[PDB]
Amino acid sequence: MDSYSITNVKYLDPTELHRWMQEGHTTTLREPFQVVDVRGSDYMGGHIKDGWHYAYSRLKQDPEYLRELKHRLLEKQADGRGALNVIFHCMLSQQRGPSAAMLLLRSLDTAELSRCRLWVLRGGFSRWQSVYGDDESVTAGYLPDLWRAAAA
């Protein structure tokens, strides 16, 4: 990235993330990626496989928590190819997704700006599960019952 502007935050569709997961890296530059689920208690009911769970509320209130995430991400990037593609997502298409990305972006030094690419998954986990919810290879801890529209 080149600056600390909101325009540096990119958006990804579920179909493209799924493709990255199938291949094990991004399609264009073959770079690594890491999903960061920033939901709180609404994390319940299923999540993207191999993603990390860092609640937005705590990232925003605890600088040490944000620092921990940054450190983990950069540590993973150091042993990988090129820049690490970090993907943030919420439950739905919410403002907390890009806000979480901005929190990380603002915590990066000018030297670390080039080590990451920031993305937000359009639609959140809600859109994700409507398509890949029952796909065991990309979704973990899924509870079909909770997402039933016309249940009990």
Swiss-Prot record:
Remaining remarks: Present with 2310 molecules/cell in log phase SD medium.
Source organism (scientific name): Saccharomyces cerevisiae (strain ATCC 204508 / S288c)
Record GO terms (molecular function): phosphatase activity; protein tyrosine phosphatase activity; thiosulfate-cyanide sulfurtransferase activity
Activity sensitivity to pH: Optimum pH is 7.5.
PROSITE patterns: RHODANESE_3
Subcellular location: Cytoplasm; Nucleus
Enzyme Commission number: 3.1.3.-
Name recorded for this polypeptide: CDC25-like phosphatase YCH1
Enzyme category, top tier: hydrolase
